[PDB]
Amino acid sequence: YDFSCELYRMSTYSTFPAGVPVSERSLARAGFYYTGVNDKVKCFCCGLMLDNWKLGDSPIQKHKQLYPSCSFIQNLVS
Ligand SMILES: [Zn+2]
């Protein structure tokens, strides 16, 4: 289903900057791929864009909170 998709998302983090305080795996699992700019990531499903990640930030929570209508985030959490 989203099998290869999550794996593709993971691959986009090859250039992710070193000091970002959230794991790339968690980002990719939350539906986000890396835009190649700063620490800005984008949902493959709804296009929600997020950057300036802080220690302890939950990509899934931010995702659910900001753009609940995303089918991916709805199905991930259900
Ligand atoms: Zn989304």
Swiss-Prot record:
Each BIR repeat, start to end: 6-73
Superkingdom of source: Eukaryota
Post-translational modification comment from the UniProt entry: Auto-ubiquitinated and degraded by the proteasome in apoptotic cells.
Tissue: Present in many fetal and adult tissues. Mainly expressed in adult skeletal muscle, thymus, testis, ovary, and pancreas, low or absent in brain and peripheral blood leukocytes.
Subcellular location: Cytoplasm; Nucleus
Family indicated by similarity: Belongs to the IAP family.
Assembly notes: Interacts with DIABLO/SMAC and with PRSS25; these interactions inhibit apoptotic suppressor activity. Interacts with CASP9. Interacts (via BIR domains) with TRAF2; the interaction is required for IKBKE ubiquitination. Interacts with E2F1, RIPK1, RIPK2, RIPK3, RIPK4, BIRC5/survivin and USP19. HSP90AB1. Interacts with UBXN1. Interacts with GSK3B. Interacts with several death receptors, inclusing FAS, TNFRSF10A and TNFRSF10B. Recruited to TNFRSF10B in the absence of receptor stimulation. When TNFRSF10B is stimulated, further recruited to the receptor and cleaved by caspases.
Biological role: Multi-functional protein which regulates not only caspases and apoptosis, but also modulates inflammatory signaling and immunity, mitogenic kinase signaling, and cell proliferation, as well as cell invasion and metastasis. Acts as an E3 ubiquitin-protein ligase regulating NF-kappa-B signaling and regulates both canonical and non-canonical NF-kappa-B signaling by acting in opposite directions: acts as a positive regulator of the canonical pathway and suppresses constitutive activation of non-canonical NF-kappa-B signaling.
Domain characteristics, as noted in the entry: The BIR domains mediate nuclear localization.
Name of the protein in its database record: Baculoviral IAP repeat-containing protein 2
Organism: Homo sapiens
Shown chain mapped onto the complete sequence: 41 to 118 of 618
